[PDB]
Amino acid sequence: MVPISPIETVPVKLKPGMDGPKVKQWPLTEEKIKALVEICTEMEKEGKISKIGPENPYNTPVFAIWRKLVDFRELNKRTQDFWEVQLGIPHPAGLKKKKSVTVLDVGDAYFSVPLDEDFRKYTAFTIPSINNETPGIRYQYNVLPQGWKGSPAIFQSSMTKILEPFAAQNPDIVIYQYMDDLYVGSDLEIGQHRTKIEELRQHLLRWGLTTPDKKHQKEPPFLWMGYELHPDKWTVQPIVLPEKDSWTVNDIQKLVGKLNWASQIYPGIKVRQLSKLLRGTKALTEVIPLTEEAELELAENREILKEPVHGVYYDPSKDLIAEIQKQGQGQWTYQIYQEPFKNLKTGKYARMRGAHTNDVKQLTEAVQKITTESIVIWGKTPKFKLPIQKETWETWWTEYWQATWIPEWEFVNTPPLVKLWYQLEKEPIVGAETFYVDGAANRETKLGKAGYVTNKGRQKVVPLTNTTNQKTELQAIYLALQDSGLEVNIVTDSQYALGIIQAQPDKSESELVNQIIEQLIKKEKVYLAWVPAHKGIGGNEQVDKLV
Amino acid sequence: IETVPVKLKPGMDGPKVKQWPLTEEKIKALVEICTEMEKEGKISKIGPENPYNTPVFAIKKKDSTKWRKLVDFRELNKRTQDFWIPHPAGLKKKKSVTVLDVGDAYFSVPLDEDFRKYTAFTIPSINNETPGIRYQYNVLPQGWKGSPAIFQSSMTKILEPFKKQNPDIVIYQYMDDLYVGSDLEIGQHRTKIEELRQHLLRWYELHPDKWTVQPIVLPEKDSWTVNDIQKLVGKLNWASQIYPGIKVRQLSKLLRGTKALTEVIPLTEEAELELAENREILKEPVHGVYYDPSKDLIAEIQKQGQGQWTYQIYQEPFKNLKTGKYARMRGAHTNDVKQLTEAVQKITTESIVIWGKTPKFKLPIQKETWETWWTEYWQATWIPEWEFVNTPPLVKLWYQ
Numbered sequence A: 001m002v003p004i005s006p007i008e009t010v011p012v013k014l015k016p017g018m019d020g021p022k023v024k025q026w027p028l029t030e031e032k033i034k035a036l037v038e039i040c041t042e043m044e045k046e047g048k049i050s051k052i053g054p055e056n057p058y059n060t061p062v063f064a065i066w067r068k069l070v071d072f073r074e075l076n077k078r079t080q081d082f083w084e085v086q087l088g089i090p091h092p093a094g095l096k097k098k099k100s101v102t103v104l105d106v107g108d109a110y111f112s113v114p115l116d117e118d119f120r121k122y123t124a125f126t127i128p129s130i131n132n133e134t135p136g137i138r139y140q141y142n143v144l145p146q147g148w149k150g151s152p153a154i155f156q157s158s159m160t161k162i163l164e165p166f167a168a169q170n171p172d173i174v175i176y177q178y179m180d181d182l183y184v185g186s187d188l189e190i191g192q193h194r195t196k197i198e199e200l201r202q203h204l205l206r207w208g209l210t211t212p213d214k215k216h217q218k219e220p221p222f223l224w225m226g227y228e229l230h231p232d233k234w235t236v237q238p239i240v241l242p243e244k245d246s247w248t249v250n251d252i253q254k255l256v257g258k259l260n261w262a263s264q265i266y267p268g269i270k271v272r273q274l275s276k277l278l279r280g281t282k283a284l285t286e287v288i289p290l291t292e293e294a295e296l297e298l299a300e301n302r303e304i305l306k307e308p309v310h311g312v313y314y315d316p317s318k319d320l321i322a323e324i325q326k327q328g329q330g331q332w333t334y335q336i337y338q339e340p341f342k343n344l345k346t347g348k349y350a351r352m353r354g355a356h357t358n359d360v361k362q363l364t365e366a367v368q369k370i371t372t373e374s375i376v377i378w379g380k381t382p383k384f385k386l387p388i389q390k391e392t393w394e395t396w397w398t399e400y401w402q403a404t405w406i407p408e409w410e411f412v413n414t415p416p417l418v419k420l421w422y423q424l425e426k427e428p429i430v431g432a433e434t435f436y437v438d439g440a441a442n443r444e445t446k447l448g449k450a451g452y453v454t455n456k457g458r459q460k461v462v463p464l465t466n467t468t469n470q471k472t473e474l475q476a477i478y479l480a481l482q483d484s485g486l487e488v489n490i491v492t493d494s495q496y497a498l499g500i501i502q503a504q505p506d507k508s509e510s511e512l513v514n515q516i517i518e519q520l521i522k523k524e525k526v527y528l529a530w531v532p533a534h535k536g537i538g539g540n541e542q543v544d545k546l547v
Numbered sequence B: 001i002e003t004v005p006v007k008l009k010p011g012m013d014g015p016k017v018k019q020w021p022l023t024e025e026k027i028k029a030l031v032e033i034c035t036e037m038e039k040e041g042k043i044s045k046i047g048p049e050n051p052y053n054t055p056v057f058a059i060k061k062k063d064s065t066k067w068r069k070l071v072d073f074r075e076l077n078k079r080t081q082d083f084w085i086p087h088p089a090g091l092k093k094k095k096s097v098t099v100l101d102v103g104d105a106y107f108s109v110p111l112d113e114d115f116r117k118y119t120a121f122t123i124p125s126i127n128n129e130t131p132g133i134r135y136q137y138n139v140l141p142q143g144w145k146g147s148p149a150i151f152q153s154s155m156t157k158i159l160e161p162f163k164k165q166n167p168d169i170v171i172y173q174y175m176d177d178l179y180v181g182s183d184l185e186i187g188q189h190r191t192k193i194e195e196l197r198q199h200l201l202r203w204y205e206l207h208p209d210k211w212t213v214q215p216i217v218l219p220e221k222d223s224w225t226v227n228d229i230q231k232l233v234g235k236l237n238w239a240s241q242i243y244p245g246i247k248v249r250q251l252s253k254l255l256r257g258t259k260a261l262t263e264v265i266p267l268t269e270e271a272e273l274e275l276a277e278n279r280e281i282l283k284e285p286v287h288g289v290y291y292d293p294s295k296d297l298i299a300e301i302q303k304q305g306q307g308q309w310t311y312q313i314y315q316e317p318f319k320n321l322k323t324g325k326y327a328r329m330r331g332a333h334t335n336d337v338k339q340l341t342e343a344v345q346k347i348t349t350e351s352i353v354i355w356g357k358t359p360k361f362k363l364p365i366q367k368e369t370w371e372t373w374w375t376e377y378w379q380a381t382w383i384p385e386w387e388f389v390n391t392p393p394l395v396k397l398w399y400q
Ligand SMILES: Cc1c(Oc2ccccc2OCCn2ccc(=O)[nH]c2=O)cc(N(C)C(=O)CCl)c2ccc(C#N)cc12
Pocket: A090, A091, A092, A095, A096, A097, A098, A099, A101, A174, A175, A176, A177, A178, A183, A184, A185, A186, A218, A220, A222, A223, A224, A229, A230, A231, A232, A313, B129
């Protein structure tokens, strides 16, 4: 017999202060008992389990469907935490084209990884005897049980330690481990590739691990986690948008799931309206009517999802490019590619929940998202193509009160272009009328007044029903914008209004703010000055609006 | 040569912080560095039974082309038991202070056996292809608060001759940094620094004297417009929260009526007297401003434009312990985030020299931008805490 190298065991403990599981065995039928006796007899003959005496106080229920199935949920609740087997799943666009990719089945190695001796007593289980007239057969696991908490992590760690020297001494190949399957790619000649595959089978056999000589069942196109992986390209598994006369809540969640999933390769997918219909529902069976906007959006989705689109694999020798387009209503779409017209992948970005926003902020956020995604997938920041002029960005970041930055980028003329819609002056405007504005409201009756007095004697006070102080302050500024020329100075005491306008929004939830924005767009020069209220600053008439 | 028992605070588990993504060059740099450290026994690979993790990344210090390994021990530091020196109040009063990196000395002292599993970190893989290279420390790690506490005795033994030789030189230690303050000449200071580094070998010019607290100043004009007077009343009204006797009624008296903003208003005599009294009041220090070692230090930064930044360190509102203006230009003329990050580092250093601890920052930047880019320009061995302000503060120009 050729000596088999031992696999190092991982020391395992239970959670602090807890004890091993002690669960009552399920009563089983006579046939199920016989099946489990045969299966456990074979497994004991193979070494996966061992018989134990009555001293072991722990027990885990067993079932059969034959096939044995041990329910380790309690022991899992009582087992220590392990380092996550995988932090995330890879993305196909990060893979690098290989001339040859082979699949090896290391499933028989799963039951060949030993379990820590001092922990085996916690895996004890009992087979009930026929008519319960004898003590049930007591077993414990000697290897990693499937369904136990630490089996995938310990298995992947052991396999990684086994594969480390082979991968080190063969840098011209690539080995990947996923569940009980290995994937070995190389650009070598097919003969050399099969040769090194045989070498890997031998190196794995030096630990007693058997890879089947049978030709594996997996073969291109590889279907994996909703993906199609081909020798030269990748895509998503076919996305079919169903034809529904009426759409319920689960139909809209499945449609937005298919659209979110398909958006990573299909450019231009929009999910704003369809997801908007699911806002604040919390009812799975509720039937919600479809808005016209959701109908046009769904039609555009069916037009985009008409024919299949594929993504290419990553070539590290070429530059990485990411191009962004604005879609309106806070929607953004982007393509990441290296060669024109051949996308590595695509995606979308929706604006965050906010009361006020502008296009430049959203474009910046999207750039940050694409940057993080690209560092994840490819390990580098891409060069950007953005629909915004260089001078626009320069004005924005030079004048913005917050620090901001986007990495290396170039302007691409693809409307709609992100632009600054208004710019407040830094100094008062000579020759322009000065509007001292103010507003006020009663907290009980919700009655208020908003208005202005100017240096030329122009005045206005308007009474308002069902309003607040902040609303009357904004309304005052709006009135001043309405009745003034193309250049105007505006004086207010509203720290609230200044807080809104200094954030430079181009869209808002409040229709009043949006009206103020529309007035600002029409102006040539606007200087907005702030003063403290109730300090006797003349012109600023608090008593005029509190009548 | 002998391990000291180290434990965590009662009821707290080890740190379990997600490793953020890294570029390929940083990953490779960490692979080389950690390979070398493993050959030196400073770290060792760990198995899946270790669930704890602390983030790691790579930087490049000043005047160097070699990569350096940075570990974000903030969570482990706040979860590590409190170790137990009064802060040298004369370090900030010294003429010059030099910062030295003594982090290599920690690697000669082994780490407590049972505590090593809490120092676990992960070199990540691109695209989650491999599980990531997992390590734990066997010696005192750089960045952990227990390293200077444990090494304090040996450091006293090494610095005892130099301290006995020069009683006029102040020596302070914070994390992996050694602050050496004196009053000598720049050349004599540099030769003395080489003397101390060769003294430490066989076993950053900073001038706090050129730093003072900044007063509130008011304009001096011969002619005031309506806008000028309005801004002045605004700034005086803001300053009245800090200074009691600030009076603005005589200046607000001039703003009576609805005049154009650019119209020149002559000051009355009462307004001149009021303004002069307010100047005299602003020339005095703030009443009842003390430091409390039990409270956090809060630092606020405002972006003033043209590479200028303002900052205030305080503990209670309107009770500033420090104020300053960082306008230095060092290869960051086109990058706001790099400027902000350098400013945060300098303010943290000043706070370390003055109080011996780092402040909590309020940063004028969106969370996503900062968290995306701040590691790109970080050069210090420590990391402070920070939060993000999304509403433009009105007081910005009042610090300009
Ligand atoms: C074939 C396969 C993976 O491929 C590779 C394996 C080894 C080296 C390079 C590879 O990819 C290069 C790109 N490529 C892809 C297919 C092809 O024919 N030619 C080609 O060049 C990668 C996977 N992922 C995503 C992994 O995280 C590795 Cl476990 C797989 C996952 C599941 C399945 C199944 N069934 C199969 C997987």
